[PDB]
Structures are given as C-alpha cells and as structure tokens.
Enzyme design. Structure first.
Site, PDB file in Angstrom:
ATOM      1  N   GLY A   1       0.855  -1.175   0.206  1.00 28.46           N
ATOM      2  CA  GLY A   1       0.091  -0.128  -0.088  1.00 28.46           C
ATOM      3  C   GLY A   1       0.921   1.172  -0.076  1.00 28.46           C
TER       4      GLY A   1
ATOM      5  N   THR B   1      -0.445   4.261  -2.229  1.00 25.79           N
ATOM      6  CA  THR B   1      -1.536   4.784  -1.842  1.00 25.79           C
ATOM      7  C   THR B   1      -1.285   5.622  -0.269  1.00 25.79           C
ATOM      8  OG1 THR B   1      -2.786   2.615  -2.464  1.00 25.79           O
ATOM      9  CG2 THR B   1      -4.021   3.886  -0.492  1.00 25.79           C
TER      10      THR B   1
ATOM     11  N   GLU C   1       8.497   5.782  -7.217  1.00 23.61           N
ATOM     12  CA  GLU C   1       9.621   4.887  -7.610  1.00 23.61           C
ATOM     13  C   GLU C   1       9.519   4.889  -9.174  1.00 23.61           C
ATOM     14  OE1 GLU C   1      10.793   0.673  -6.472  1.00 23.61           O
ATOM     15  OE2 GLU C   1       8.686   0.410  -6.078  1.00 23.61           O
TER      16      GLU C   1
ATOM     17  N   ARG D   1      10.336   3.695  -1.750  1.00 23.12           N
ATOM     18  CA  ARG D   1      11.524   2.793  -1.565  1.00 23.12           C
ATOM     19  C   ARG D   1      12.786   3.751  -1.479  1.00 23.12           C
ATOM     20  NH1 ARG D   1       8.954  -1.796  -4.715  1.00 23.12           N
ATOM     21  NH2 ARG D   1       8.047  -3.247  -3.018  1.00 23.12           N
TER      22      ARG D   1
HETATM   23  C1  J7W Z   1       8.993  -7.004 -14.438  1.00 19.05           C
HETATM   24  C2  J7W Z   1       9.522  -8.166 -14.026  1.00 19.05           C
HETATM   25  C3  J7W Z   1       9.684  -9.290 -14.991  1.00 19.05           C
HETATM   26  C4  J7W Z   1      10.090 -10.446 -14.522  1.00 19.05           C
HETATM   27  C5  J7W Z   1      10.637 -10.792 -13.317  1.00 19.05           C
HETATM   28  N1  J7W Z   1      11.246 -12.131 -13.292  1.00 19.05           N
HETATM   29  C6  J7W Z   1      11.721 -12.515 -11.962  1.00 19.05           C
HETATM   30  O1  J7W Z   1      11.859 -12.084 -11.112  1.00 19.05           O
HETATM   31  C7  J7W Z   1      12.062 -13.975 -12.119  1.00 19.05           C
HETATM   32  C8  J7W Z   1      13.161 -14.571 -11.586  1.00 19.05           C
HETATM   33  C9  J7W Z   1      13.525 -15.964 -11.575  1.00 19.05           C
HETATM   34  C10 J7W Z   1      12.879 -16.809 -12.331  1.00 19.05           C
HETATM   35  C11 J7W Z   1      13.034 -18.325 -12.316  1.00 19.05           C
HETATM   36  N2  J7W Z   1      14.472 -18.503 -13.011  1.00 19.05           N
HETATM   37  C12 J7W Z   1      14.586 -19.672 -13.364  1.00 19.05           C
HETATM   38  C13 J7W Z   1      15.963 -20.045 -13.448  1.00 19.05           C
HETATM   39  N3  J7W Z   1      16.383 -19.312 -14.834  1.00 19.05           N
HETATM   40  C14 J7W Z   1      17.729 -19.485 -15.250  1.00 19.05           C
HETATM   41  C15 J7W Z   1      16.418 -17.890 -14.388  1.00 19.05           C
HETATM   42  C16 J7W Z   1      14.930 -17.564 -14.004  1.00 19.05           C
HETATM   43  C17 J7W Z   1      11.727 -16.370 -12.912  1.00 19.05           C
HETATM   44  C18 J7W Z   1      11.222 -14.932 -12.890  1.00 19.05           C
HETATM   45  C19 J7W Z   1      10.669  -9.871 -12.285  1.00 19.05           C
HETATM   46  C20 J7W Z   1       9.925  -8.554 -12.711  1.00 19.05           C
HETATM   47  N4  J7W Z   1      10.055  -7.529 -11.750  1.00 19.05           N
HETATM   48  C21 J7W Z   1      10.923  -7.047 -10.953  1.00 19.05           C
HETATM   49  N5  J7W Z   1      11.075  -5.789 -10.523  1.00 19.05           N
HETATM   50  C22 J7W Z   1      12.377  -5.795  -9.786  1.00 19.05           C
HETATM   51  C23 J7W Z   1      12.358  -4.391  -9.006  1.00 19.05           C
HETATM   52  N6  J7W Z   1      11.358  -3.606  -8.746  1.00 19.05           N
HETATM   53  C24 J7W Z   1      11.460  -2.426  -8.117  1.00 19.05           C
HETATM   54  N7  J7W Z   1      10.362  -1.869  -8.060  1.00 19.05           N
HETATM   55  C25 J7W Z   1      12.827  -1.940  -8.008  1.00 19.05           C
HETATM   56  C26 J7W Z   1      13.877  -2.761  -8.205  1.00 19.05           C
HETATM   57  N8  J7W Z   1      15.124  -2.231  -8.118  1.00 19.05           N
HETATM   58  N9  J7W Z   1      13.505  -3.974  -8.951  1.00 19.05           N
HETATM   59  C27 J7W Z   1      12.772  -6.585  -9.560  1.00 19.05           C
HETATM   60  S1  J7W Z   1      12.370  -8.073 -10.527  1.00 19.05           S
HETATM   61  O1  UDP Z   2      -5.552  -0.162   2.590  1.00 20.51           O
HETATM   62  C1  UDP Z   2      -5.258  -0.397   1.308  1.00 20.51           C
HETATM   63  C2  UDP Z   2      -4.498  -0.330   0.607  1.00 20.51           C
HETATM   64  C3  UDP Z   2      -3.887  -0.496  -0.755  1.00 20.51           C
HETATM   65  N1  UDP Z   2      -5.372  -0.917  -1.439  1.00 20.51           N
HETATM   66  C4  UDP Z   2      -5.218  -1.155  -2.717  1.00 20.51           C
HETATM   67  O2  UDP Z   2      -4.061  -2.377  -2.847  1.00 20.51           O
HETATM   68  C5  UDP Z   2      -3.591  -2.087  -4.110  1.00 20.51           C
HETATM   69  C6  UDP Z   2      -2.041  -2.021  -4.049  1.00 20.51           C
HETATM   70  O3  UDP Z   2      -1.452  -0.989  -3.141  1.00 20.51           O
HETATM   71  P1  UDP Z   2      -0.593   0.245  -3.646  1.00 20.51           P
HETATM   72  O4  UDP Z   2      -0.712   0.166  -5.261  1.00 20.51           O
HETATM   73  O5  UDP Z   2      -0.584   1.336  -2.829  1.00 20.51           O
HETATM   74  O6  UDP Z   2       0.828  -0.715  -3.404  1.00 20.51           O
HETATM   75  P2  UDP Z   2       2.474  -0.408  -3.745  1.00 20.51           P
HETATM   76  O7  UDP Z   2       2.989  -1.565  -4.522  1.00 20.51           O
HETATM   77  O8  UDP Z   2       2.482   0.937  -3.867  1.00 20.51           O
HETATM   78  O9  UDP Z   2       2.986  -1.075  -2.169  1.00 20.51           O
HETATM   79  C7  UDP Z   2      -4.268  -0.935  -4.941  1.00 20.51           C
HETATM   80  O10 UDP Z   2      -4.968  -1.368  -5.738  1.00 20.51           O
HETATM   81  C8  UDP Z   2      -4.859  -0.142  -3.821  1.00 20.51           C
HETATM   82  O11 UDP Z   2      -5.599   0.827  -4.144  1.00 20.51           O
HETATM   83  C9  UDP Z   2      -6.339  -0.997  -0.663  1.00 20.51           C
HETATM   84  O12 UDP Z   2      -7.426  -1.524  -1.299  1.00 20.51           O
HETATM   85  N2  UDP Z   2      -6.416  -0.883   0.715  1.00 20.51           N
END
Ligand code: J7W
Ligand code: UDP
Ligand code: J7W
Ligand code: UDP
Ligand code: NA
Ligand code: NA
Lengths: 230, 230
Positions: free
Chosen positions: A15, A18, A35, A100
């Site tokens: 959340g 939010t 973020e 974050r």
């Molecule tokens: C958008 C997306 C797409 C795909 C994946 N995928 C995986 O996390 C994932 C890993 C492992 C596996 C299995 N594994 C098997 C073995 N092979 C070799 C290799 C894969 C499958 C899937 C993650 C994301 N999201 C992510 N967001 C972040 C992030 N979010 C922030 N807000 C800030 C920040 N700094 N970082 C980190 S990851």
């Molecule tokens: O008390 C709460 C907090 C969040 N949400 C809902 O939960 C989802 C995820 O929250 P948010 O996007 O704020 O999460 P974040 O990834 O930013 O932590 C959204 O659809 C919000 O509207 C909710 O219904 N009640």
C-alpha cells in the site's frame, strides 16, 4: 531549512503508493518521490528504456537483471536529487517521502535476482561495486524508514485488487521471499549492509493488513510522532 | 596548484602506454592514469570482474558489451578521481596524463559496439543516458587532448610486436574502423558529442608511425609547447 528524508519500504502491493499519495496531501511541507519502476509500468527516453527492459525481463530475467537493476537504481538517484533540489525551498519543516530507496533496490530486488540465478557472480559483484561507488559519489542519506508491513496473503489479495495484467501471475512464494528480506532488514535487523549509518537509522513499522484508504488517521498520528523524534 | 588534465587518444597499439611511461619519467610534476581495461589484461575485485567480463566478450560480445562498457567507464572515472585527489599536491605545474578518456569509452568503443550490433538500441540509449549523467554527477573536464595518430597497418604491426595471444586475431578492418572514428573526432572534428566544451578543447596531433622508443625528444618538445599554451 534542510529536508528530512524518509523511505517508505514494503512488499509489492503493501500500500506504499496509496500511503504516500495520502501523506503528500496533508501538508505543504510534505512531498513524495514515486518509484521510477512504478512510472515505467504507468513519453520520456527513460520511460521508453524502462518499458523496454521491464518487458524483456518477463522473457529472459537471466539476460536483463543486471541492466534492469543498474538503470532502475540510476533513475531513482536522479529522481531523488531532482526533488531534493527543486521543492520545499520555502517550507518550514520540509519532509521528502521516497517510495522505496537505493537500499531496497540492492538488498531486496538485486539481491533476490542474484539468489534466483538471474545474475551470475560477476554481474552481482559489478552491481554491488557500482552501487557502493554510485552512492558515495551524505546527500540522500535517510533520516528514517517507515516499514508498511503486510502478510504475503494481503499483498496477493492487493495485486488482484490493483488489476495490472502483467502482475496476476506473481505467486505467493515470491512474495513470501520478498517479505522475508523485509523482516530481516527492517524488523529483526539481521541483515549486514555496506552502509554503516543504516544500523542507527530509526524505523517506524506500521501493520497495514487492514484497509486504510478511508481510515488512516492512526497511521498518520504514528508518522507525525515519528517525524517529531528525528 | 590546479592539475592540468590531458587525455592521450589513439588506436589500439598506436603507442599510448609507451608514450605515457616516457612522459611520467621526465618531470616530478607529471603523472599518468593507465587505462583500467589495460590493467585487466595485465588481485583486486575490480580486476577479477574485468578479467571475467573481457573473457566473456570473446565468446558473446552481444551478451556482454553493455556490462563491459559501463564497468570499463565506471572504473576509469574512479581511477581518474583517485589520481586527481592523491598526487601532485606539492607540484608547481602539475599535469595528469589520462590513458584515453570517458569520451573514447563512448564515441570510440561503446559507439563501435552499437554499430557492430553488440548493443541493441535500449542498451545504447541506457548507456548514453548513464554516461551523460555519470559525468555531470567540471572535475575531470580536459584542458587538452594529444592524438597519437598511426595508420591501421602500423597498429597491426605493433599488435604483432606486443605479442598478446588474445589480440593476434584483430583484423585490419576493425582497426580501419577505430582509425576512422579517431580521425572524425580529433582531426576533421566532424563528430557531434553531447559535451559542449569538447569543441573548443585544444588538440595536439602527433604522427607516431616511426618508432619513438629511442627517439622521442621531438614529440616531447611538441608536448611541452602544447602544455605552455594551456
Ligand atoms: C517486471 C519483472 C519481470 C520478470 C521478473 N522475473 C523474476 O523475478 C524471475 C526470476 C527468476 C525466475 C526463475 N528462474 C529460473 C532459472 N532461470 C535461469 C532464471 C529464471 C523467474 C522470474 C521480475 C520482474 N520484476 C522485478 N522488479 C524488480 C524491481 N522492482 C522495483 N520496484 C525496484 C527494483 N530495483 N527492482 C525486480 S524483478
Ligand atoms: O489499504 C489499502 C491499501 C491498498 N489498497 C489497494 O491495494 C492495491 C495495492 O496498493 P499500492 O498500489 O498502494 O501498493 P504498492 O505497490 O505501492 O505498495 C491498490 O489497488 C490499492 O488501491 C487497498 O485497497 N486498501
Ligand atoms: C576484449 C574484446 C573481446 C571481444 C571483442 N569483440 C568485438 O568487438 C566484436 C564485435 C562484433 C563482432 C561480430 N558480430 C557479429 C554479429 N553478432 C550478433 C555480434 C558480433 C565480433 C567481435 C572486443 C573486445 N575488446 C574491446 N575492448 C573495448 C574497449 N577497450 C577499451 N580499452 C576501453 C573501452 N571502453 N572499450 C571495446 S571491445
Ligand atoms: O614507437 C614505438 C611504439 C610502440 N612500440 C611497441 O608497440 C607495441 C604497442 O604499443 P603500446 O602498448 O604502447 O600501445 P597502446 O595500446 O598503449 O597504444 C608495444 O609492444 C610497444 O613496445 C614500438 O615498438 N615502437
Ligand atoms: Na504536499
Ligand atoms: Na612523474
């Protein structure tokens, strides 16, 4: 005067967006840094880039994790410095809420990708070296952290609620893993990091399992009491 | 007083390492920053990292070019700042000779890798964005550039002479391409870069086709006359 810097930390869909969008409204002295990853999955060159790397991560995380994490963290630092240099210039008690931090980028996400074998040792060590250095070269150092603590089950229900198509396949197990890292870092404080001051840095933990969209005064009271001690 | 910053630029095996190791000896006011890539192909964590990425580049340049170029450029900035903050403190006319620059990293190497399809558009645009930003966030800005200009044929003979096993497969065509970028950047000055001041920055061009190991006084005379005008 000098801006107070507070990171909001928590699992996916806890959340945080939010919560910050509630806080920004309650005071003219209060601002929010969203973020950059959140803005990529909403046109700037940063957004086309991030949009392209997010998509490629779904296909081949073991190809794109290094590229993603470095660009995600760069984009956060530049967005954090723009807010720090452009706002709350004639604010009396200015507070800047980061969605974050550079520390979540590394000890939650990049770390998790290394452990999921999406980065090899060379990529993880290059990343950590880059991160250590990128951060040294006291400016974005945090005055405090607010941990929005929620069960993986609440976060899984809230991903459903948020209704992003791309996110509906996230399994409980993945959230359980992210949850575990948040607990070790912010609650038990068992996580070694390479940033000495973080061990002192005050942490407010808020249980957000109960819906707060229409009932957040108690959370805000705890935030204002937290801010008063810094 | 304030250190003068001079980049030495040139094709592979033009004689830049030979030249800087001559200069460093001729004055106590003169110091040299070796190219970190050169030190990786000679134990620091940076060296293990660089050694690993250099090796992986031979197998799969289209997998590792982004990772290589970002880490090569980070490593150069940190090595440039360490020399700038640790030496020539009680020097009267301090000069710091950089073996290549952040500009060769980008407009020679990274650019060449993008054109050889070893980086896709997303990697090249992320790299350029990172580079623009990494450099802004006047400190390592150059007072002048010394171009050691040599024909690709001389450089091919000198790779043979240097006798690095890893390098003996470099074809004339590759050197002809690097040569062309050096000519456009430093001689014809036809290359647009994203750094306004570079267009003013003085350039000394030295023809180094003739061996100079035992006969370099004329080159050094031109360097001292160049330094006097800055
Ligand atoms: C958008 C997306 C797409 C795909 C994946 N995928 C995986 O996390 C994932 C890993 C492992 C596996 C299995 N594994 C098997 C073995 N092979 C070799 C290799 C894969 C499958 C899937 C993650 C994301 N999201 C992510 N967001 C972040 C992030 N979010 C922030 N807000 C800030 C920040 N700094 N970082 C980190 S990851
Ligand atoms: O008390 C709460 C907090 C969040 N949400 C809902 O939960 C989802 C995820 O929250 P948010 O996007 O704020 O999460 P974040 O990834 O930013 O932590 C959204 O659809 C919000 O509207 C909710 O219904 N009640
Ligand atoms: C060590 C090594 C290993 C391998 C390669 N390889 C290729 O350059 C190369 C490209 C293209 C090709 C064909 N092409 C066909 C099509 N597929 C898809 C894709 C490959 C084959 C090979 C280059 C190197 N050296 C390099 N050093 C730098 C460098 N050096 C500095 N000093 C500073 C700096 N910043 N950068 C840049 S590159
Ligand atoms: O006038 C010269 C300049 C260089 N070299 C040799 O040419 C090779 C390449 O020069 P260097 O390593 O200095 O090239 P760089 O890559 O640093 O430009 C080395 O074996 C040098 O000893 C030479 O015989 N005569
Ligand atoms: Na506000
Ligand atoms: Na010297």
């Amino acid at each position: 005067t000098r801006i107070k810097k507070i990171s909001i930390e928590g699992n996916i869909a806890a959340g945080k967006s939010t919560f910050v969008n509630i806080l920004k409204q309650l005071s003219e002295d209060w601002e929010v840094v969203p973020e950059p990853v959140a803005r990529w999955s909403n046109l700037t060159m940063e957004q086309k880039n991030g949009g392209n790397v997010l998509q490629m991560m779904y296909e081949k995380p073991e190809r794109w994790s290094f590229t993603f994490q470095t660009y995600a963290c760069l984009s956060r630092i530049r967005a954090q410095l723009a807010s720090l240099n452009g706002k709350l210039k004639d604010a009396e008690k200015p507070v800047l809420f980061f969605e974050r931090s550079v520390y979540s980028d590394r000890y939650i996400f990049a770390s998790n990708l290394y452990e999921s074998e999406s980065m090899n040792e060379t990529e993880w060590t290059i990343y950590q070296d880059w991160h250590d250095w990128m951060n040294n070269q006291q400016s974005l150092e945090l005055d405090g952290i607010i941990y929005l603590q929620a069960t993986p089950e609440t976060c899984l229900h809230r991903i459903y609620l948020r209704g992003r198509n791309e996110e509906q396949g996230i399994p409980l197990e993945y959230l359980e893993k992210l949850h575990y890292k948040h607990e070790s870092w912010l609650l038990h404080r068992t996580l070694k990091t390479n940033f000495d001051y973080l061990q002192e840095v005050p942490i407010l933990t808020l249980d957000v399992n109960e819906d707060f969209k229409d009932k957040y005064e108690s959370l805000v009271e705890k935030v204002k009491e937290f801010l008063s001690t810094l």
